[PDB]
């Protein structure tokens, strides 16, 4: 029963990018105009 409890992990593992993506989206937008 290998890898288990990876939807929850995950999600919780990719909660750092969540963050980081936003920020790092919005000055390329910003940028542009």
Known sequence: ???SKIK???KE???AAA???G???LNA???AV
């Open 1 to 3: 029963g290998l890898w």
């Open 8 to 10: 929850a992990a995950g």
């Open 19 to 21: 963050k980081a993506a």
């Open 13 to 15: 593992a990719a909660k």
């Open 29 to 31: 937008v910003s940028e």
């Open 23 to 25: 920020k790092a989206a």
